[PDB]
Symmetry: D2
């Protein structure tokens, strides 16, 4: 007998094959900085914004130690970070089999370690997904090139009616973004997946399984949000310029984990002050210091 009487995060950061070689020969894409910080800070900060404190980072065997050196066990930021390896890039849905013991009987959320988001009320957008305990929640976002993505088709009433992975003739311009919230059904659904035509375990098949059960919520992520492309060297550069323009204008940083932990009340002023000390001689540490004596609405 079980007794009745929260949600766990996973970041998939398993590199990018040979696609961005030779730039990425020496290091994983998700460790490349976007402007002033490692790329993985952005998706990590996204889970943190969602209220998620227990997080599994999945990376290659080769680069797990570098992620561990960067991020540690999470204790500096009021988190618990665990690590797992992905020996072979067999697809996104593999995160649930690799993370099966990590997930246990809890709800979960998956984010791609190369996905950057920005916008107003993002916290509330994520909170509504997080609070849907049952079913799956995903986000749809209008893009120029939906053929590159999982694409969501809507009826005249706005109801999601189909999902297609990289269709040659997209039914809409609405791509499914790399942020996914799941209930306790996901690991079993994932265990029963067959590899696609490309020998790959597809997240879109998972989401379609939920859709078929009538348990997929598709929330629109509106045009006033920025979901930044990191798929090409060109988009990477644009991502960096975007973040720089925002931060240099505002004097506020996007996806600074120290700050988000501090505003979530996972760390206090004294602990924030300690995290500042080692980087006091650069703008990043000076930024952390300033946050101790400024009200930011």
């Amino acid at each position: 007998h079980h007794h009745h009487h929260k949600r766990k995060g996973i970041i998939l950061a398993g590199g990018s094959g040979t696609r961005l070689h030779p730039a990425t020969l020496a290091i994983s894409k998700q460790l490349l900085p976007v402007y002033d910080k490692p790329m993985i800070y952005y998706p990590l900060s996204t889970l943190m914004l969602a209220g998620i404190r227990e997080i599994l980072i999945i990376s290659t065997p080769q680069d797990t130690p570098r992620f561990q050196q960067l991020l540690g066990d999470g204790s500096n930021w009021g988190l618990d970070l665990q690590y797992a390896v992905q020996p072979s890039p067999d697809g996104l849905a593999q995160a649930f089999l690799i993370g099966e013991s990590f997930i246990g009987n809890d709800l979960s959320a998956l984010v791609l370690g190369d996905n950057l988001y920005y916008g107003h009320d993002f916290h509330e957008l994520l909170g509504s997904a997080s609070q849907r305990q049952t079913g799956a929640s995903v986000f749809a976002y209008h893009v120029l090139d939906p053929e590159r993505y999982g694409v969501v088709e809507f009826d005249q009433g706005g109801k999601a009616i189909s999902l297609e992975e990289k269709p040659l003739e997209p039914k809409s311009n609405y791509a499914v973004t790399g942020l996914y919230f799941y209930d306790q059904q996901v690991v079993d659904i994932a265990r029963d997946l067959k590899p696609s035509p490309r020998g790959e375990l597809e997240i879109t098949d998972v989401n379609r399984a939920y859709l078929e059960r009538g348990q997929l919520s598709v929330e629109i992520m509106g045009r006033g949000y920025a979901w930044l492309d990191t798929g090409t060297h060109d988009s990477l550069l644009e991502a960096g310029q975007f973040i720089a323009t925002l931060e240099n204008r505002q004097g506020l940083k996007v996806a600074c984990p120290e700050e988000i932990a501090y505003r979530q009340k996972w760390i206090d002023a004294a602990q924030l002050e300690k995290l500042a000390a080692p980087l006091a001689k650069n703008g990043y540490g000076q930024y952390l210091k300033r946050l101790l004596t400024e009200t930011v609405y």
Copy 2:
């Protein structure tokens, strides 16, 4: 006797002195494009988002005809556009004396013709300002360099308690943005202003007058909004790159007046189709065409 029984817009687009010379020797700043469209499209689109259909464009004598050629009388976009000249750059609050006959007994809103905004729920942010019929509404936005702006000081409860124009030691990092909503008190307040130390009629003195009457609402424009700097050649370039990254990612345009009029139901599908015809051979006209047969949430 009067009988009881809406809001009018003004765009101040009077160039920028010799500050950006020689770039601006041949044309007004507010006619320079930001990426794919004239700069003035952005603030105009902002008033339109606010529901404002009756709009006065104030510019130099020299460049009024170029604005008129670009924008016409507004009828193509379901607007009414009127024009006035500013012979001498005597300051922002002068818009109310120049626009006194235009404003009549109505509520009003002023936007700077070089101010660009972007973000999620911007429509709702503007709608709440617009619906406050009484008093004045402005927006405060965290910036790196508040000393360049009107700066708003808040007490521990978040109440605005003072305003200072370009203080050497800012009380906060919260700048007052170039978007202002006013009731019928503004023209009289403006008529009674004395020129500042720089022989200039200050908008901050207007706003302070409302603050002193207890009739200033300061709404925070949060960090997830982008209020883009156009004060320098460097910021202008960043503004252009920002818009380009957003539009090329999304396949949706920022501050396309044809689109906003169409979504506000100020023009119909047949009229939108006609506006598309003359630019059918470029991406702008092709964009307008696509909007006729796509649902965009």
Copy 3:
């Protein structure tokens, strides 16, 4: 012998509308200065002081207002209009009386160049008293341009304007040096199938006689693209990154006039006054007392 310059700054049509609905592309700035400063600076660097600016009927007065007669910068500027965009070769019909019996050079008003020894690359073109000189430059999209084909020995053997199947990746740049033959060649041109008097036909005229020098503008040079919104932006970011790293401006005509000895220390000082309170005037004042090699 004298060589006169022509800048063609005509219309880009509706192709960049609405950004260019109010004013022509070449009057807009690239970063910190009007686009036209860059081609003008190019001719000045080539040692050319007598220059005809050709633009649309609507915008010629505004070019006249921006640049004047040139005497502030040691130049002798004149102006003319191209009523319709009927081809680049039309520059020599419009500018026939301006050219007279002199050598000539044509630059396109939206073309930006940069690199080391640009002065000497131009000087060597300017020095050829006979024939015509053009520059070929490797580009990813040669189909947009006049395309030069070379034999195995490096010799130019053909030119095709916007070929559907380009013979090489070498584009002819928007800078052309001609001898006294070009007017008579241009006045015999017939309109092409797309309806224009083609500069590539003028160039093929010289090529058929062995009198077209096609010099390679190497990859260490920047010929920046201004044909799209995207490329206009890249040009702004390119000039800004160079200028902010070096503290030296690209295509500042006051500076170029001063280094050519066309204006003196005193005259550059007067030019610095009006913009003393901004970066451009500050730059020009610094030129008075800094040795730049």
Copy 4:
């Protein structure tokens, strides 16, 4: 006589942290390729095939993994470590046995160069069998660098490292050519007040004997800044704008090896295979059948 190359790719400290917390700056890409490809390409362009790469203890194995022994690219690469950032002059102590009795050249691992005839600017430096050659370049912020002062006749008369009051806007670039004297000069260096064995002291050693050639790297050259987050970004956008306009890559070592005749058509074909499905491999295959001037 043989000239050997050294690339110093040491630590930037905590100054770019956290972006560089996980891995050193010079292993990160600039646009499409690892930063270190650019300085390596610079030495290769200078005709140097025997090259010692010096990095931090933690990252040397990763440079070893990226570049191998060099034989795929017609190079002979070796590796060594700088345990602590105790000065650029330390390169010659670490690399003493590597250098032996040969001429040498040092490039900083985070320095990017671009422009026309860069090959000939380097070649002329390489050809000087005696003394030392450096390059001076006008910058807005000379206080960050080794600063060269010139008399009215153009002669270098002093060097100051990071002066509070710089004597000119001319910075010494991160590229240095030395004769057989440099090791013996470096082994006599004492640490400066900031605690480093200074390359500027090595250069002043040559200057005191009339044996420092200070050549001007002109404004038509790009020496890009990689010292800040802002400048790293500008470098990426600068390389991208050049490469996308031209269809030609800056500092592709496979290409440079191929043009130097250090690898043949067959060997470049093998190098193209692994990345055939992306832009880099496609670029390299195209080099086999395209004449680029």
